[PDB]
Amino acid sequence: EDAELLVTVRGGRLRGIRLKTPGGPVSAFLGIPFAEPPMGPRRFLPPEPKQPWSGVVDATTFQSVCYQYVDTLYPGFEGTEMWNPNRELSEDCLYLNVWTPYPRPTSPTPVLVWIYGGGFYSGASSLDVYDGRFLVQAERTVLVSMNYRVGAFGFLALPGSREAPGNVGLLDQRLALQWVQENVAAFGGDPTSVTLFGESAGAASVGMHLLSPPSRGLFHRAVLQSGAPNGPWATVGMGEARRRATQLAHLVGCPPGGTGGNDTELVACLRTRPAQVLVNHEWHVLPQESVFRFSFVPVVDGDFLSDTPEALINAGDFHGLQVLVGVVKDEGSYFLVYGAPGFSKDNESLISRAEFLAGVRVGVPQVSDLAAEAVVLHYTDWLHPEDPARLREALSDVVGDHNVVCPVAQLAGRLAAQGARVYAYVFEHRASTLSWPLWMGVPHGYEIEFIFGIPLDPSRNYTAEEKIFAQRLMRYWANFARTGDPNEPRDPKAPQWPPYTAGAQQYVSLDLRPLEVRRGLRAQACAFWNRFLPKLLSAT
Amino acid sequence: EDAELLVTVRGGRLRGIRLKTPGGPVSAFLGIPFAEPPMGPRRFLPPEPKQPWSGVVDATTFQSVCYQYVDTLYPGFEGTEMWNPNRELSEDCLYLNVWTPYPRPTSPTPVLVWIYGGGFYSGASSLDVYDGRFLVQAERTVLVSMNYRVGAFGFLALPGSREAPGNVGLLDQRLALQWVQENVAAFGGDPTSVTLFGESAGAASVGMHLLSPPSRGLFHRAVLQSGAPNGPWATVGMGEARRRATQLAHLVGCPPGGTGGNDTELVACLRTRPAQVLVNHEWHVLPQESVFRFSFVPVVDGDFLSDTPEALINAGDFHGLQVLVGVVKDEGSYFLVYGAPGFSKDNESLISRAEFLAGVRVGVPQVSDLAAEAVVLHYTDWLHPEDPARLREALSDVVGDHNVVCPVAQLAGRLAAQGARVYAYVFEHRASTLSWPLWMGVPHGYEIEFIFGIPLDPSRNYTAEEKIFAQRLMRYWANFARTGDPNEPRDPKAPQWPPYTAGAQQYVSLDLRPLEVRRGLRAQACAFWNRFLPKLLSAT
Numbered sequence A, B: 001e002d003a004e005l006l007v008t009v010r011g012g013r014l015r016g017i018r019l020k021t022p023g024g025p026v027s028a029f030l031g032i033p034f035a036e037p038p039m040g041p042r043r044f045l046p047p048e049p050k051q052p053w054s055g056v057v058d059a060t061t062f063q064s065v066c067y068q069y070v071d072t073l074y075p076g077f078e079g080t081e082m083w084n085p086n087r088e089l090s091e092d093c094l095y096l097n098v099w100t101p102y103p104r105p106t107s108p109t110p111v112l113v114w115i116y117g118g119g120f121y122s123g124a125s126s127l128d129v130y131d132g133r134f135l136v137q138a139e140r141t142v143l144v145s146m147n148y149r150v151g152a153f154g155f156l157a158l159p160g161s162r163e164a165p166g167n168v169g170l171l172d173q174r175l176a177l178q179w180v181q182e183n184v185a186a187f188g189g190d191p192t193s194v195t196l197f198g199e200s201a202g203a204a205s206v207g208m209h210l211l212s213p214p215s216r217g218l219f220h221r222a223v224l225q226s227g228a229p230n231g232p233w234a235t236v237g238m239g240e241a242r243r244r245a246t247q248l249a250h251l252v253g254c255p256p257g258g259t260g261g262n263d264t265e266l267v268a269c270l271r272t273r274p275a276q277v278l279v280n281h282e283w284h285v286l287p288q289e290s291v292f293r294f295s296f297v298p299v300v301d302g303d304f305l306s307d308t309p310e311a312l313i314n315a316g317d318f319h320g321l322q323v324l325v326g327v328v329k330d331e332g333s334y335f336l337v338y339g340a341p342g343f344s345k346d347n348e349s350l351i352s353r354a355e356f357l358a359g360v361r362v363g364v365p366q367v368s369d370l371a372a373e374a375v376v377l378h379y380t381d382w383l384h385p386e387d388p389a390r391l392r393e394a395l396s397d398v399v400g401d402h403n404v405v406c407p408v409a410q411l412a413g414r415l416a417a418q419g420a421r422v423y424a425y426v427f428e429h430r431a432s433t434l435s436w437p438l439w440m441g442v443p444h445g446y447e448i449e450f451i452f453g454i455p456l457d458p459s460r461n462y463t464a465e466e467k468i469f470a471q472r473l474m475r476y477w478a479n480f481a482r483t484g485d486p487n488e489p490r491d492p493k494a495p496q497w498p499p500y501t502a503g504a505q506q507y508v509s510l511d512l513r514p515l516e517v518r519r520g521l522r523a524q525a526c527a528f529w530n531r532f533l534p535k536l537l538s539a540t
């Protein structure tokens, strides 16, 4: 028995497992309970710390996935099932994982903490694409990842009430960060050098931890990949959250007709239902037909977020803060086969103009007809207003800029102009083993496998260039975790990555070619979303 | 005694004059009266045909310029003096000029008819830049140019009244075209092949003759240079025309204190005033501070224009029509020193961001604050929003696209898609002798000297390539006048000028280099002015 696979934390003793990489072994501790199981009367309630245990808890395999919707549109398809749960579903899912270098670092090592995405309705830390054995081996970093409640179990909010306050999924993440502060030293990690990084909804969660004072003291750096807390999908108002929670109760027979009314009777009725029943009606509470819109998301209630994310970003003071942000080349292409007319992943999706005009109302839901015409004006090539290929790329840009690129650019500009050191990138490499159609280019979420060094897996069919490219990316992320600067501290041969400023707006392109400096994260398109359209919506 | 300088027309006999060109002599008949002098009780009235005369009218020099405002901002400056009157001012100004080749053509020759511009408030056919001796000698065509009343004397309108019906300046042009149909054969001209061409307000006049049935049968081809009848400056409503006419009457003491102010007594009071007194208050009736806006323009009253030029262009049948339209490279740069803050012709006019935002309200007058925001959104380089050089060219584009380029492109597209054969150009050569500052580029109106072959003047310091360039353009304009096709019908080696279509939107660039085919007359910018902005103004 290896002595390094046995670690004592504040709650008790753990037994880890040993993972193999082509470059050496890594010690992993998968399935550490950091909270009491939020079951029965604890559903919709904030998490409670895990009570100390007797004996040796087995931490050799991933624990259960939180209850969530499962994508079944394309059975057996790799592009969709890689995000589906790989463990059985259960409300007893609040567990975290710790990948530590081996031999265990004798000196405090910076810590990376991963928060998965999934529109706040799905995701799991046990996915193969989030395997941190290659990143920990190649860069000798301590990597931590947790599970948090998604869907109604994590973000159903009846504002004002104590039985369903909302944002408990964000509190699950906060408790996992407190666990890192109190226990990551036992694994060789430095609790004074904690870097959060997440993608999509995980990136939005990272941004909300920066804007929440109680969470701000639990970390020191932030990485937001293809997401931001100020996105049109990341938050919801108190009134809309109450309507969505009330309809979900109605769809499952709550309250029993006709007795019931207040939130105490409504949540009590919701707690008597099998968790699967609540999942089966989640997508039936959205207000309209749309893409990139989710039912139960963080609510702006004044507690976890004293104001809207946009308000907190503008009024924020971010001195002494290092942030790394970026997007992929084709942020919106993936979402078009989930609602936009004329689109299919199994053909070329060469839509007509009538389908393009209809798709704008799906990609930009709940806006006036005049606002839709302003969108069509900006995203139409009026020399080729009928070309199906250009219209396909246009609608992809409409969804990507509205939901990802411009919310991130707005955040990156305000952060750098208010004391924060910011670095920006654009991921432009399409994996050679990508199963999605070619017209989608570099879809949303397909830089993650290169950040985690998945091409180093010998059982996979990546090329030799993608292996070297993956190692260069892991260097960038690890250097930012250690020094707050993605550049090599001393290497002068490698081209440099300049910070992102509100004026120069410099970023770099990440692909097989060396670094290339560019200016402006779609300055022309994002000026429409961030500056003009809000004024157009004010004057209805 | 040259017998070719004596010609008899329907009204009487004339004596012409021989003009010298480096390639040969030309016969000219300058100062032919085509209408009774609109003086005294004839002020503001439609023109009457010139009564027949006894003897030989002398036609050896230009007649008087119609009463008009004189630009005196820069005394002695060639850039402004070249457009000022070069003969004495008088209301007795309705005279036309005929240049005919020598020896006089024994065969019917196609006729070019020039209509000068000047915002309908100025201009004259006697200007040196409109000299037709070079175009007539080089291409052996017949050129005719007329004078028409400008300002209040030609376009003061009290709609519904009979003393000042309006558009009488347009009727002066129509009468001159009826004169060409009845007398151009005496000069060797073909009345069955008449091609109109004009610039700025003259181009807008040619467009209004296309949309007026009584004028349409007097010509067969049209050329519109840097102007169109659907421009925001070329027409005015009945209510606004009445307000401007009433305000001008008030400024000159009409009606007297205690006198009724009906249309009969108001115009009667205006007729007793000296012509210069009316000119001295012309610029004091415009609604607000602006550029490219003129006080007395053609009125839409249902007579000369049965509907707005936009309505007539859309619902028009143009089969059997060849049009040649085009613009210069920097249409709006010249108007900026006439009202835009921070601009001066004697410095670099490196305006600030605040001066750019203020100039937008001067260049686009009477639009909502939201409409101005959309203009700033489209014409701001959000990667360099404060660069003074880019702001200068941006405001130049705002004035040029809003007043010239986009009104012309909209007309060229509707004509081609409704039966007319259309050719489009963009003039991109800046004259070597241009006195305006360099930052203005190719200003409004500075292709005329090349169309009329002015570089061939030995007394002027043009370069040898501009001389050959002027001969190319005179060949283009003559070929279009003869055959309706500017391309050489005998040389397939030379680059071809493809017709302008609503789909391909092809045009050619006119400079010292050979023809270059391009697509789209600022399609992105003109989609804002022609499509989105009207929808914004309706929703206010």
Ligand SMILES: O=C(/C=N/O)NCCN1CCCCCC1
Pocket: A083, A117, A118, A119, A123, A199, A200, A291, A292, A335, A338, A444, A445, A446
């Ligand atoms: O977020 C959505 C939107 N579906 O319409 N689907 C889940 C797919 N994503 C794709 C990559 C982001 C990480 C979670 C998995």
Ligand SMILES: O=C(/C=N/O)NCCN1CCCCCC1
Pocket: B083, B117, B118, B119, B122, B123, B199, B200, B291, B292, B335, B338, B444, B445, B446
């Ligand atoms: O048309 C204007 C507008 N002034 O603000 N000014 C007269 C100058 N133009 C020069 C170019 C068009 C030919 C007529 C005379």
